[PDB]
Amino acid sequence: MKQLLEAGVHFGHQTRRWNPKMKKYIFTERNGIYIIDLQKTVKKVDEAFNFMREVASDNGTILFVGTKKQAQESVRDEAIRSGQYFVNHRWLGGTLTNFETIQKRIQHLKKIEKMEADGTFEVLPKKEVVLLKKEQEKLERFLGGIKDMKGLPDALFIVDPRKERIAVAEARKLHIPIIGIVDTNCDPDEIDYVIPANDDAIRAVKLLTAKMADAIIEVNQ
RNA sequence: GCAUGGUUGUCGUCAGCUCGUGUCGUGAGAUGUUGGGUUAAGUCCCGCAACGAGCGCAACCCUUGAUUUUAGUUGCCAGCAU
Ligand SMILES: [Mg+2]
Ligand SMILES: [Mg+2]
Ligand SMILES: [Mg+2]
Ligand SMILES: [Mg+2]
Ligand SMILES: [Mg+2]
Ligand SMILES: [Mg+2]
DSSP: OOHHHHTSSOOOOBSTTOOGGGGGGBOSOOSSBOOBOHHHHHHHHHHHHHHHHHHTTTSOOEEEEOOSTTTHHHHHHHHHHHTOEEEOSOOOTTSSTTHHHHHHHHHHHHHHHHHTTTSOSOSSSSHIIIIIHHHHHHHHHHHGGGGGOOSOOSEEEESOTTTOHHHHHHHHTTTOOEEEEEOTTSOTTTOSEEEEOOSSOHHHHHHHHHHHHHHHTTTOO
């Protein structure tokens, strides 16, 4: 939470595309670009560091959502390190609300990645070549890291509520508390523990999400 | 045969018709099944608030077109004598 470390890149978005209810975090606007106040950020990042206290205390599960283009590389590595669960590519509709039917796809993937190793690897001459191996990559590229999620997630960590409208809407309905990095165009009401920060910078996203890794890997020892 | 069972024609071998869970809408409804390519084909790919499934399409069946082993009778006659 070093203010100098945060001072690297935390700008925001243009003036034309700002949410009027983020004005609390706006400080020292510039020519055509808003700049968010770092003083409140370092204060507010503490709660998200300390709200995530309880959720991971009992070996709970957390979900990372990184559909944004400058997010997949970070969230993938943040969750594999901590033994957590992540989403990189498009968020499947009803991943949480219609979570019961997702297991069928998950169990299907587990079955398929068993036959070439444990069962009859060769069951068809070339049918499995064109269809069976083609679907196993199709399933993993969307399911990704949630393939070992035993139950409903305990908390969510998103990076862009404007680009994760499906996720934030279907997590509120299921009453799961979320933490996320919001920009000058996002909405703070939807998020529980707001972290006003830039989302467009690769380093800025990696800086903040790396703190969450150390936060969770502390208790689970 | 306007009380019915069974059987059949026709649109038409046209490529469509629905369902489970989820979501949007006060509601009838909607989505999936739409959008960009491709195909004989909702046949397949990419995207997508949807994820999958069933009956259909395709294949599995018969027949014709090339060829190997088995078998020489009532079939055939290479090489033969009649
Ligand atoms: Mg009649
Ligand atoms: Mg046809
Ligand atoms: Mg419809
Ligand atoms: Mg189409
Ligand atoms: Mg063809
Ligand atoms: Mg079909």
